[PDB]
């Protein structure tokens, strides 16, 4: 399907983000929106904004039902994080990594969004072998 919801480099630890979005993956919008609205983790509100924007875009831009959509896939793309120096005992310095990541989710409203990739790959191999055989057709 369509109506993915990207987000560029929000401050978040990817470790917790993966777990929370694997908890939220699979289910539909409302039955998951209510549960994420009560998530004790702090990341949920940031993801909540993204999912509300995603369903709004799906309804407005794409005209889909929105109710039958569900989280097909979660990925938390790690972006260039921050590195900061903190003094430490015995005269040392330590480089602590302030972690941020790119958050984006996929919405599906069908028994599909998996086969079409296979068809595209098969077509790619088909044109590859067509070119190979056209080269072999030289006389």
């Amino acid at each position: 399907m369509i109506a993915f919801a990207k987000q560029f480099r929000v401050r978040i630890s990817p470790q917790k983000a993966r777990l929370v979005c694997q908890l939220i993956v699979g289910k539909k919008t409302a039955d998951a929106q209510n549960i994420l609205s009560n998530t004790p983790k702090k990341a949920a509100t940031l993801i909540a904004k993204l999912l509300n924007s995603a369903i709004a875009n799906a309804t407005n831009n794409h005209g889909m039902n929105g109710d039958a959509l569900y989280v097909f896939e979660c990925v938390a793309n790690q972006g260039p994080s921050m590195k900061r120096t903190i003094p430490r005992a015995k005269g040392s310095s330590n480089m602590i990594t302030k972690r941020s990541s790119n958050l984006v989710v996929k919405l599906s409203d069908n028994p599909n969004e998996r086969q079409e990739l296979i068809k595209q790959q098969k077509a790619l191999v088909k044109k590859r072998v067509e070119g190979q055989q056209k080269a072999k057709m030289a006389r």
């Binding site: 777990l19 694997q22 908890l23 209510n34 549960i35 004790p40």
Partner: peptide, 8 residues
């Protein structure tokens, strides 16, 4: 370390 859901 996998988490579970909560009550509703």
């Amino acid at each position: 370390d996998a988490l579970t859901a909560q009550a509703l």
